[PDB]
Design an enzyme around this catalytic site. Structure first.
Site, short mmCIF file in Angstrom:
data_model
loop_
_atom_site.label_atom_id
_atom_site.label_comp_id
_atom_site.label_asym_id
_atom_site.label_seq_id
_atom_site.Cartn_x
_atom_site.Cartn_y
_atom_site.Cartn_z
N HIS A 41 0.81 -1.23 0.00
CA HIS A 41 0.00 0.00 0.00
C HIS A 41 0.85 1.28 0.00
O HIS A 41 0.30 2.37 0.21
CB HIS A 41 -0.97 0.01 1.19
N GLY A 141 3.22 5.89 10.21
CA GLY A 141 4.62 5.78 9.87
C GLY A 141 5.28 4.49 10.30
O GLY A 141 6.46 4.29 10.00
N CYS A 143 4.16 1.25 9.58
CA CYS A 143 3.99 0.11 8.69
C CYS A 143 5.34 -0.26 8.07
O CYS A 143 6.13 0.61 7.70
CB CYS A 143 2.95 0.41 7.61
#
Lengths: 297, 5, 297, 5
Positions: A41, A141, A143
């Site tokens: 993503h 922030g 991920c």
């Protein structure tokens, strides 16, 4: 001697943390060999439910910004695998440890190295629930922060953070791209499935209590393993199998697994003012091996 | 409803 | 978004861990520049209350075998400082991080890198109690394990494990050789002094709860800080001083420090079967800075 | 009584 939630040393995982940036978005990646694993993503900006197959064809390798500290890596090729991207870069990582890829099962633990902008900020102990979720601590922030286990001198990467189902409930993917549990990388309603108390861990936690001079729950009655599972399905407890470590703990302590199982069902109905290692509730976040290395090593 | 981190 | 006890990354401490062997006793040490710090208890063997000034006369440098990994280090001279030995070795440690030597005060947290045989095994979060102790997890071979704080890219070493006072209660020395609390490296009975619940940490933990859904305990009543300290003398709580990080947490959540102190007093007499971040008891093991960095960073 | 580690 005392028992804590311990974490694995982070020295061979830290030099692999990098920052991946496509478009407006930056998250964290893992740089092993000439590859960089990160959540897919990172190429969306489309919010909600993206269309990753078609979004991937506008993608060009030169619009990825990979940063190992302040060195910049360049992307040759890429590949979408499950819900993660495997980026190929110019440079072999010179600090690659001997590493493998694995999948943790419910009850088992691992260490999460929380990162932001490709910089490790801390590490914490986590237990995979039967929801296939973990109770971690993640903000925007985070991920791409990896979960790993140290198997002696080698790293077995097992987790890459991606999603927050509910408050304090997180999940992610293994390093084949597949989500833990029936979840996906979309901001859609995803309420976690049914969770159960990890019994093998609760047994190991109680053996830990006996090693620490806390044995007031030990009694004469015993409950079988197969007779416990019948009781567990209706009172929020997981199944239990035979475990060599639990047998080792059972021999060193002098009280059987069947006595601890019978102690658990009695303490499911309340602790009655008294405390187990300063606790009021069952602790199911420590596997038998975690309890074993804090009692013998 | 789930938040993409 | 979840609250856990985190640990500092261990990459700058691990390359500094050495084993120190005298006679046949082996413990751990810390290698910085051309010095090696380790407990003086390494030269004893004769149990109970050793005569350290008397044992020093027979000790010569050639009988220390210090090893970093598989490399052997040669000791030139040594020096007994307090309850530690500062060994001067031939080699200047090439992986010495930018470091300083500090002293933790009660309520402040740090990270212990548990080591055995000069080999790191794991790390965990600990809090210095008012009893100048920590709730750690140590066995034989663990003395010399260091506790440290990460400060940007600098390592502030603060702790060297030495002693287990009672079950699950430990202490040790700063890097000037002085014990934390009124203790000493002797096998005589030293049960710890009185301990208090760290109020500043409990305040921070409740702010974390407020930022994480749970805020039912917040009410309009307020108790001043100095009115809290008079109440804290007789209810097992420590004194509390004003704090920017608490002020910052107060400003973010919209709840004053005095509301949290008043909420602490009401909840000192039962959580009413309700839970705060899945807990039924106060948590005093997270400093304000620990909480703030897991709410913002 | 205290144990030296």
């Amino acid at each position: 001697s005392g028992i804590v939630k311990m974490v694995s040393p982070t020295s061979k995982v830290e030099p692999c943390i990098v920052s991946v940036t496509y478009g407006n978005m930056t998250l964290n990646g893992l740089w092993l060999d000439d590859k960089v694993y990160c959540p897919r993503h990172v190429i969306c900006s489309d919010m909600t439910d993206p269309d990753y197959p078609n979004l991937l064809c506008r993608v060009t390798s030169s619009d990825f910004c990979v940063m190992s500290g302040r060195m910049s890596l360049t992307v040759m090729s890429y590949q979408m695998q499950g819900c993660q991207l495997v980026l190929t870069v110019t440079l072999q990582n010179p600090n690659t440890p001997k590493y493998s890829f694995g999948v943790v099962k419910p009850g088992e633990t691992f260490t999460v190295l929380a990162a932001y902008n490709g910089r490790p900020q801390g590490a914490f102990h986590v237990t995979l629930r039967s929801s296939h979720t973990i109770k971690g601590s993640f903000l925007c922030g985070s991920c791409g922060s990896v979960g790993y286990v140290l198997t002696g001198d080698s790293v077995r990467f097992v987790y890459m953070h991606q999603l927050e189902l509910s408050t304090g409930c997180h999940t992610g993917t293994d390093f084949s791209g597949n989500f833990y549990g029936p979840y996906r990388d979309a901001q859609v309603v995803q309420l976690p499935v049914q969770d159960y108390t990890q019994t093998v861990n609760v047994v190991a936690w109680l053996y830990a209590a006996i090693f620490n001079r806390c044995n007031w729950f030990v009694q004469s009655d015993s409950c079988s393993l197969e007779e416990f599972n019948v009781w567990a399905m209706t009172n929020g407890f997981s199944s239990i199998k035979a475990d060599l470590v639990l047998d080792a703990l059972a021999s060193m302590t002098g009280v059987t697994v069947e006595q601890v199982l019978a102690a658990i069902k009695r303490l499911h109905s309340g602790f009655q003012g008294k405390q187990i290692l300063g606790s009021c509730v069952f602790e199911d976040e420590l596997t038998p091996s975690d309890v074993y290395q804090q009692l013998a090593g | 409803x789930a938040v993409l981190x």
